[PDB]
Design a protein around this ligand. Structure first.
Ligand SMILES: CCN(CCn1cccn1)C(=O)Cc1ccc(Oc2ccc(C#N)c(C)c2)cc1
Length: 187
């Protein structure tokens, strides 16, 4: 019922030490926007996972021109301050809905409006921790030879394949997605 090539793919040369469940997204990615706002893929996947399992989510550089790099660093700041849940929706909307995010200054305005003090954003932005998080996200994408988003990898061996699942019903799709990750995490 869970055959290889249908719900998932397998990496030709796995990545040792990868997180158990790794999501790659871009704030420019049309389907990543749905995955956040309409499907809630991350929340629904976490719900089907054993309670002692961490999920990791990384931003990618290769969409959005120069802004893709700035958003990857801003996402690193978000991870460093632990404010992902305060900035995810206004970044998605500013980039894709209203298209009001066109510079690094615009990203910063989102964080300030979300309650992060301007000076603390800047200090995080220029910190060694954020430098290292940026490196981590880029290495993770290179390690799996990531070509596009959204993507989810399980134990650095298995790559989810949403296009082999049933996509005519949003809620059936999300259930098949979350159930496929639980299966794969059990491998
Ligand atoms: C990595 C490739 N990639 C980018 C380029 N690309 C491919 C097709 C369109 N763009 C993806 O987007 C991959 C993809 C993801 C999901 C998915 O299925 C659904 C999406 C939204 C909803 C809703 N709401 C439903 C119900 C299903 C289909 C495909």
């Amino acid at each position: 019922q869970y055959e290889d090539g249908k719900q998932y793919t397998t990496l030709e040369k796995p990545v040792a030490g990868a997180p158990q469940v790794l999501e790659f997204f871009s704030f420019f990615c049309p389907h990543c926007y749905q995955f956040e706002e309409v499907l809630h893929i991350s929340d629904n996947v976490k719900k089907k996972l054993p309670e002692g399992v961490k999920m990791t989510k990384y931003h990618v550089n290769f969409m959005g021109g120069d802004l893709g790099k700035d958003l990857t660093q801003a996402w690193a700041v978000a991870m460093a301050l632990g404010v992902e849940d305060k900035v995810t929706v206004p970044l998605f909307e500013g980039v894709q809905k209203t298209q009001t995010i066109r510079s690094a200054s615009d990203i910063r305005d989102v964080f300030i409006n979300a309650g992060i003090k301007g000076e603390e954003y800047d200090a995080a932005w220029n910190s060694f921790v954020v430098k290292s998080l940026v490196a981590q996200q880029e290495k993770a994408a290179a390690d799996v030879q990531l070509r596009g988003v959204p993507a989810m990898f399980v134990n650095g061996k298995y790559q989810l394949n949403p296009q082999g699942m049933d996509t005519s019903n949003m809620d059936v799709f999300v259930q098949q997605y979350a159930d496929t990750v639980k299966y794969l995490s059990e491998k």
